[PDB]
Amino acid sequence: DDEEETYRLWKIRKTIMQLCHDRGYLVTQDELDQTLEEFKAQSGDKPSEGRPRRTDLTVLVAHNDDPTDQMFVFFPEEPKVGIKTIKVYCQRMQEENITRALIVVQQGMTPSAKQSLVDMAPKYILEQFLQQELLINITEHELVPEHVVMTKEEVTELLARYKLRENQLPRIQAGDPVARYFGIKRGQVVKIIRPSETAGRYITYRLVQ
Amino acid sequence: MLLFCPGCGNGLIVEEGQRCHRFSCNTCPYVHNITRKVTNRKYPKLKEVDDVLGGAAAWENVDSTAESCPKCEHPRAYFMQLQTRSADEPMTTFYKCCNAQCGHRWR
Amino acid sequence: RMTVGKLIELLAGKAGVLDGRFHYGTAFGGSKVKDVCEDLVRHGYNYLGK
Amino acid sequence: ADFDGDEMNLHLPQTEEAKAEALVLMGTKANLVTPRNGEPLIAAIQDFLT
Amino acid sequence: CSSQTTSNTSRYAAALYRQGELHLTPLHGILQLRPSFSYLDKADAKHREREAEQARQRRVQSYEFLQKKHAEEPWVHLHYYGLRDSRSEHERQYLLCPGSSGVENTELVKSPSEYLMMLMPPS
Amino acid sequence: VIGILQMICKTCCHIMLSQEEKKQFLDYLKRPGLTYLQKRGLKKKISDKCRKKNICHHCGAFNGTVKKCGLLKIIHEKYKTNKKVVDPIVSNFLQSFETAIEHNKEVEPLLGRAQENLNPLVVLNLFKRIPAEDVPLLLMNPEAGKPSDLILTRLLVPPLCIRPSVVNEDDLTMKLTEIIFLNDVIKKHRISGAKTQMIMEDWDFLQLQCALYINSELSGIPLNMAPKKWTRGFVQRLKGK
Amino acid sequence: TEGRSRDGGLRLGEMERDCLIGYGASMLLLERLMISSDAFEVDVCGQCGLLGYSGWCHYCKSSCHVSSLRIPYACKLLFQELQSMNIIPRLKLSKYN
Amino acid sequence: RPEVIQSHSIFEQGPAEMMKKKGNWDKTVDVSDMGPSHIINIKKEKRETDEETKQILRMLPKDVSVAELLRELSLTKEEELLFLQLPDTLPGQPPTQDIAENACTLADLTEGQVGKLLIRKSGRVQLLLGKVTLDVTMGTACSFLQELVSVGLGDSRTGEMTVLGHVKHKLVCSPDFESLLDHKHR
Amino acid sequence: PGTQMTLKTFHFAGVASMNITLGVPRIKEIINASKAISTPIITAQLDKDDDADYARLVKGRIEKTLLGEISEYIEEVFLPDDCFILVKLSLERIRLLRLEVNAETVRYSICTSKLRVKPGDVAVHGEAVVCVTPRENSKSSMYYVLQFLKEDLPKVVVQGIPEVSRAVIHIDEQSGKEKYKLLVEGDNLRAVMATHGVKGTRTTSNNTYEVEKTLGIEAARTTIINEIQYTMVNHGMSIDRRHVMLLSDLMTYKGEVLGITRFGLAKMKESVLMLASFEKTADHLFDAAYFGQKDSVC
Amino acid sequence: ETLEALILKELSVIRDHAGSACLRELDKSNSPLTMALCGSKGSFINISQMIACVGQQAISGSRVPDGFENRSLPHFEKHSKLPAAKGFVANSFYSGLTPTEFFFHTMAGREGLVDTAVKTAETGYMQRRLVKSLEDLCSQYDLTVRSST
Amino acid sequence: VGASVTSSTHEKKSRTNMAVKQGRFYLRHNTLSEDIPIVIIFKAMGVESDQEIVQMIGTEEHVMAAFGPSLEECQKAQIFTQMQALKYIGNKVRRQKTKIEEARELLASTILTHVPVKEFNFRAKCIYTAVMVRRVILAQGDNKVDDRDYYGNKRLELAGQLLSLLFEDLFKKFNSEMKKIADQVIPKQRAAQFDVVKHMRQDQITNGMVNAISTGNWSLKRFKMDRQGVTQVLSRLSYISALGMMTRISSQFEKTRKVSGPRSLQPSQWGMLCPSDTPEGEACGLVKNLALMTHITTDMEDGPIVKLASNLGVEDVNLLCGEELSYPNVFLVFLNGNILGVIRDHKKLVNTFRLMRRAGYINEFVSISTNLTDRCVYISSDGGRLCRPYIIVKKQKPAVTNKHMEELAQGYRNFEDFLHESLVEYLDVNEENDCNIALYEHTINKDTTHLEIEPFTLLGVCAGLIPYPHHNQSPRNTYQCAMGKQAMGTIGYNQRNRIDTLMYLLAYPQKPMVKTKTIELIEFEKLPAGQNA
């Protein structure tokens, strides 16, 4: 004990940061291969480590298009999050004037918060995850084919090729694990590249709805 | 174990109302004062403790001796064993082995 | 289908007509093929009916 | 089918348009192989193999 | 409270064994005793009182008819004597029956033949 | 019927919703490409969002729960007593029965069970007064029909083609001749001016028989009038192998 | 009819229907299931959308909007019953171009 | 509630467990023999099974009739009461009782010797009653009180009760149908 | 082939155990896509297989283990001043199980959903024992509540992840390379894959609805193709892959695994007259009329 | 089950070796053999059963279950586990079955007949649901397959 | 788990249940509003001391532990004496002194109706429910759930069993219609006396029967049930068609649903039902045919048995208390489902009872057998159950010897003689479970107690027409059975006088060149149905 806990911390940090890399934010290559002993060097053993503050991270920005667009990652400590803690996060958010942040829960939170997660503000969006999910990166799994989100121009071109109206495309559920991983809202279109049994390849498209 | 009152033949209950605990009836004033200790329970009930410490848990339980496989004999499976049901029945042994693309786990 | 029962019936019948007799095929009993073949060879026919 | 007392139906299409479809699409010649996996189904049966 | 076990008791006999001799006696009846729980009913009654061309007869099958039939019979009371009382040995003297040790019984004349169909009458 | 009746304010016949929500769901309905499945889902959504309210904002009129009180019988629960502070309206309704309480004693034990029973007449004269602007929110297209006509007061007898002479006649015929017979009974009987009790009881059996005409599977029929023999209602000749 | 003492007539079961949707023979299973069994003709009033008789729509008291059709009898029978159960199949029709 | 827990699995000491249990439950206070806490040892609550009514101490075996009677003769030679049940009807006829073919019963016989009990090698038992032998075996074992008493109705109003003793064993007596058939063939 | 299925025997992976559903009942199971099934099976990999390191214990960390034998005996402790429950621990026996449980863990395991008994109610007098003190809850409860406290050794509600069980032999013949696996009979993919020390990235389930909830649709439709083909080939019938690819696509193009039944088909299609011809002829028609649904004929 | 596995192994290899032995002794030009080789009719298992040794009769993939208390027929002693008391048949059809073997053989045969009768409805239903959902789909000129709408 | 008994007698058919929905037991019956914990019925029943109930159920520690929970709810409820219990179950009475006696009456006469009681001495019924509970609790130890297909539990009915109920109904209805008209006439119609003979309505009985036989529908309001398809038109395709039909058995299950149960073949049928003959197709297994040598019993007197049993040492049940039952050396003794006492040294009882039967004092068809797991002795006398004759073996030598067969062949004696002299006896399915049968003489060993008269009599009457059946594969024999009925041949010597809806003949038939011995028994070759090719 305190070595399994640190192992979990290491793995969840790896996964969250990989997710942020995949969404296209600033991240440094030397962090990617941060080893568990490297984590032990940067962060001490569990009894000396303050969970709700040690792992918080906000260096990530949307450098791909806007270095001035920053985001947050938070690691609450209480088994179930309460209204006070999300208010503390949101007021910290207002002090830093940022629009997006990530939430991780060890077990869950109050239903009152669940209701609140839909109505913070149109300009403030908060995404909820569970510790027992990000402990593995679903994108690395063998049954998950490569998803690649694509811009408005690419979709324009695609549905110009087949003479489609966008609603004739097959759907991907808004709440699906991979869609929620990539953080794509309604009306976006995703390209799937399926691995054939042979060297060939098949392509298909789905609409987020 | 169960008790019935000699005077009336109904089941006893256990209670305290004075300096010392008592075995008493609910219909007649017969009672026995327990000064000593009796040593047999009803065998209580709580469900299967499976993932008490699931996954690669602590390393204090490491041990030296281990068995080996008859077919391949690769270097990774140290022993473990388990139990059946309750306080008065035997305990079992399984030899599970796992690299990839197979299904082995010997009893 | 493994109806060996028909193959025997056809031999016991043949050896039964020739000498004016009825043969029996009762369950768990009946005329044994070891006797019927020796009846046929007496009448100039081959002992397996072919 | 097995010729052990079976029965089969028959219909006579009444329109020139229906004749053309029956012959072109449903003919035996066009259906020597089953669409499940493409193996042949119309081939020789017992007593032609022997 | 007592409870009856069977109507007829003819085939039951008490016995007293003794060195060189054994004495029988027919039983008049067998009864079973159980503790009486009527006192809770009495308590219930006290609490409750503190709180506040006729059709074919079928009374033969009703319980309270039997109660009434049994109430007709008057009670009799009896003086108890325990096993500690010498009166018990005094009474116990009556079990032994006098007579010669060797006597040819006049009864039981029936032969085994007669006894077989006697106990098993024709159907 | 029970679905729609759960929506309406019993005082003014309006739908009970905020004006903002009215606008919002109007705009939702104007979304193009409306699908059958979407119609269903939206009916669920609007029912769920509406049931929470209990005051008709248009006239401040309170409304209680609507629930089936008996087989093919509906009751509304406006005059209901509550564990919380007694509503003035129910107290005024409770206190008005003194006359009958004096005439009959069994009124007193069950004066708390006095609610608003729903009869075909009251629903019909209620539905008729729903305003035009509201109907499409109830998801029934005003080109297809109107709620007022959902409750029936007339029937067609089908042609002789779809029920031949010799079944002697088809059971639909024997059903229909019985309906008219019972209808004639009521009208002469009421004209004969007898006691009220039979007039209405007689109407319940007609209601059940009219129900039994459409479909012959209903299992709630009490013992002393349940059909002794099976019969071909309409669905029986649509459904089945 | 179906019997053998009564003169008979065989059945295109739901399995045969599906075999002919196996082949994609669209005109054959129109012929087998309609032309040879229960072909029928009816008059529908385009103005009110429900069927009439003899080129005269009793619902509208006019004959300027009636048009004939060919429809299997059993489907005409279905439209009678539904209209009797107060579930009306108002059918809308157009030129075949 | 704690979460950081390092378990241990190294071998422990049995006498240490014994000492811990001793300290936990062997600190006796039975010296509190005060009046209202006294227990009469002949008034205890009792185990369910009658044979094993020894739930707290101060700190049936197989049998056969030949054994029972011979211990009742050799090892002990005092008086004892037995309860035995006889066949429906005895070999005798109703003695001058004028009879329906009623079964004879012990209630209709006289006093005196009535027969002999015969014990044979290997412990077989027979009741020699007149001209016939009836087999005898012990009955179902009993564990509850069976008191033999005598009811003296001294007067129509009142009488007297005396206990005579208790019954420890039962005997069952049966005709030997095989013997009767062998003697008289059918 | 579905009608041609003879329901052959000796399908038990050559071990006469693991009575998984197979044949036409398995086909019905996949097509219906009902969210609850019988005999779910999960598989996993960790790092390496055979002899003396890092593997077998994982088995004992997630599969069935009652409380039970970890106590050699369960005995009463009544004493004139008071009484309470005691549970013995066989640490030596545990060590041979080498489940990481100890007294303190059992202490922590209690007070979960057990009559809200506080940690102060439970006491540990030694590593070999654990004791819990009775208490009166007053909700039809009193000191004699002892009988309703008889809830510790085999079955009330327990620590760990429930809905898991054991698995048995499945040997291989191809010795050219060394290859082995871990199986599990349970209904929680998220948890088993999420355990420490398991190569999650190659776990699978034969419950399509289970995979969808945990890895998205594309993982779902790959599971359907795998399971149909495995069933057909096991029974020796050969079908082209292009038939199973199209069946799986149609079942999962709307964003969810829609079963081929009355409920799913109503969710897939839209025509009222088509639905009325299949099932539920009464309600579909009456509801259609109420909605004023206009239907094309295509 | 260890014992059953061992008994089933032994009682299968008995039939196999007897099956191999007869076939090696079997003269060429024999008729059943000609049909078996060319694949027109029959198989090697049939030939072995008609000549050498009918196999182990099995119900639901197991030896004959107990039908009386602790035995399959009163003609055998209690708790027996020997081959013949559980369905083994050492008699080829040429040499005929003995009464108990004939009964166990009938017992094994009946399962197939009940199975075939039962299977009529279930697969028909599956086919009805399956096709009713799939019928509309049609390949297009555009190479897409599109639903009806 | 659970248990139930379909208590039924001459007056009415009823049933009872027990449940374990949570761990305590409860009694479920249709006229009781809600299930009642068992101990509540016991206290109302007339035995209130819990110690005594535990004695009734059992003494072994784990059975008592598993019964334990089932009286905590009792001591929660303020239910301590019989009277309170009658009040409780009075409150729970369902209807389609009410609080006290009516509920007593219902329990006395409506629960477990088949066991009797007269003077409210319900000790007997206590034992019965105590046995019933002891089965359920012990049944959880091992999953030996009852096989309802075992033929020891199957009865057969015939023309007489059926016609009886129909005529009794009609006759009762005849009286009741004569009744109410007799009631109606005299008081009002006429002062001078009337007579019933003017109203002996003759049509009522005759119609009631002939429409019942012809239509094959047997509606009876007495049992609120109907039975369909109980008669069929006799089939006259060929000689063997009618003869075959006159030995057919039907089944109650009536193709309700697939259960993979009774359709199969179980060893219990050995020698009682034909293995080969069953209808092919959807009915396969639901319809069966009697073997060649079989008997169906009828009702007995029941008198001398209970008398004799009481002489052989069985003690009366109510003279002993509950604690006795748990001992491992006492056996129970049943009689058609009713408890009759308790006994020790059962093997003496069984051996003597068999011997008295052989001597001819007790009826021939009365069967006695042993169950060792439950340690109960089952004596059975009701009719409708099947039987076979076997030769008796003692100390490895058959009872019958060539001299007897010589006597029989010459004609000194007859079959029935072999029965008094204890050479053959009738076994029954429940009784042949106990003995050991020899199949042929040379297989006799130290223990065989019986010997088959003729094994070929295992097969039926249709299946006996195949030659060499034991050389074919099984499905082939089953096919022939059903096609032998359809063959064309002769019918009977009066066939030239019959005018009938349809009749097939053959011009020049012939008798077989290879013939079975069953062919000679039924005189088949006097009415042949084929031609030699």
Ligand SMILES: [Mg+2]
């Ligand atoms: Mg055929």
Ligand SMILES: [Zn+2]
């Ligand atoms: Zn008491």
Ligand SMILES: [Zn+2]
């Ligand atoms: Zn309003």
Ligand SMILES: [Zn+2]
């Ligand atoms: Zn018109």
